[PDB]
């Protein structure tokens, strides 16, 4: 009876879940009904405005254009001004039942199952900007039509400004203090990393601050991070934009075969602070990150270095583990992880879900304050869209889209530019025979620095990165007879102060070749540190009767003879202690003057039994001991070859 | 057993509350549907009447006013 009652409880819980799903479906249906309510009032005016704007685009064919202008400028019951007024009233909410279209559109955009670019504020503001630009284009079209007909000029600036101000005020007063300023990655992709050290330092200059990140799933993953100055009211300076590129994204967010520990903590900061440094460090299957934020003054716009808070996850014990096998994989973040418009970041987070093995980089932005103080008070605004393409590359005209290609020079007429070739039709460089294209890139080529030589080609290309003089080729592009365009991202490291190196593009003898999208980025990937040497044969403090000979330091049993050497450990680290004892009951204990023992290995009979075990350090680096001691009373100790190096870092 | 039966009764009461909320949401949806039924018939005439009333307000510019009056009449 108890078992069947429990089963009934489970069935009731299932019914409750079904009821919750039904309620969500009802909410969706009601939202769609409100959408229909908006559409049945807004469809014809919007359609006509869009058609008129599309038609009158060439001037901002004479007979039809004049006829259309006369039809639009005609002042009748059903006129273009009438449709503009109806559109404005519908957006404001001056309809029969006093329901505004802006609220319904904001509800539809917010309550959408698909996440595309960022927070709700960005998308709603983008929709409002699209509507306002459509209205402005319609008013400009009407003014141009009136000018073309040679009719009396009517100043439509006043009515257009009134409409835009009313719409912006309605938005700000009604639907602005309801939206959330939280944005996350739009997409997820399976990836298998490596169980090796990977440190990423997304730092910035003292006058700079991070304004967003971007992850692109290519042959080599990237971590494009945007940093720029702040002018006033959290505005991002366009001229100061800069990018940081990393390549170990897969090796950082995914384990190979030996688990990974994720230390999650919402790094929220108080209002007025802007994140200026994000550092990741996966020592050994343990991802821990910290954030550095500096105080920002909206009135002036100075990122002061005197006030600085740090929200670090390095000194916590709680963690989340994700087991990854060959069958499955953890969904690393993939997409443009930033606001719809570049803005300083307030909080950073790394959410981990064990059920689905997904990672989300939820963050926050100061877009609301900038919108309030720059655009919604009838001031002048300037928002920056995220860079969809690399702009830190040292290859001028990376994709051939503009004419008069000066950086690229052709040796002769065999090689030319093919408009049809390349990505869609972006005027790819075509090489057929001995002809080739060249471009000097030694001006921006920093000595002994890493570089990315990602490019896209078709046919039989050859992009040998030679030094012009002496014919020294620093890169090889042998083979590669693939037909369809594909990425050829290959890591590269520059030599010592070359200062003379030009990138050339040519086709191998015989087959032809097409080339486009030549980008050379500046990566700053790090490497595993060698490790410290905490224990050394220089500070072996001895007590009692001790006999140190060569490197065979002995321990005297049954008396006070014992060695000791304090060492500086870390909070969370792993150390490999290698030694070789040769004494009866000879042990190397690690005390902390409190009874806590971190390592204990005792010899049994004799001989130098080499032991290379490892131990952790818990969460207290108050200073430990490497004391050599023998609890026996007979055979003297004999310890040789001491070494304790931290694992990886 | 008595305690778990009481818990089941509480869960059933919660389900009844959820059903009542669902019924209220259905009533709201039906009201919105009737609102759409009214709007799909009343929107254009109301919009045009409001626009005409807003336009002819100064008299209760001669050329456009006369053209609009001819169009209306």
Author numbering:
A (entry chain A): 126 to 185, 209 to 797
B (entry chain B): 126 to 185, 209 to 221
Could you share sentences copied from the article?
Here we identified Vip3Cb1 and Vip3Cc1, the first Vip3 proteins with broad lepidopteran activity discovered outside of Bt from Paenibacillus strains in the P. popilliae-containing clade, most closely linked to P. dendritiformis. Vip3Cb1 protoxin and trypsin-processed Vip3Cb1 toxin structures were determined using Cryo-EM, resulting in density maps with an estimated resolution of 2.6 Å and 3.0 Å, respectively.
Artificial trypsin digestion mimics Vip3 activation by serine proteases abundant in lepidopteran midgut. The Vip3Cb1 N-terminus has the signature Vip3A signal peptide “ALPSF” motif. Upon activation with trypsin, cleavage occurs preferentially at Lysine 195; yet, the tetramer stays intact and undergoes large conformational changes, revealing a pore structure as determined by Cryo-EM. Although the extreme N-terminus density is lacking in the Cryo-EM density maps, modeling from Leu98 in DI is possible. The protoxin’s DI and N-terminal DII unfurl and rearrange into an extended 4 α-helical channel (α1act), while domains DIII-DV remain unchanged. The former protoxin α10 helix h2 leading into α5 (residues E205–V220) shifts down, becoming a more ordered α3act upon activation. In addition, protoxin α4 (residues 165–192) also moves down, becoming part of the newly formed channel α1act. At Pro168, there is a 63o bend in α1act which leads into the long-extended 4α-helical channel. The activated Vip3Cb1 quaternary structure is also like activated structures determined for Vip3Aa16 and Vip3Bc1, with large conformational changes in DI-II forming a long, extended α-helical channel. Vip3Cb1act tryptic site boundary modeling revealed density for the N-terminal 20 kDa fragment up to Asp185, and density resumed for the C-terminal 65 kDa fragment at Asn209, containing DII-V. Detection of a magnesium ion in the Vip3Cb1 channel is evidence that Vip3Cb1 can function as a pore for ions, causing osmotic imbalance and insect cell death. This magnesium ion was also observed in the Vip3Aa16act structure, similarly coordinated by the Asn (N163) side chain with a similar bond length (3.6 Å), and this Asn residue is highly conserved in Vip3 sequences.
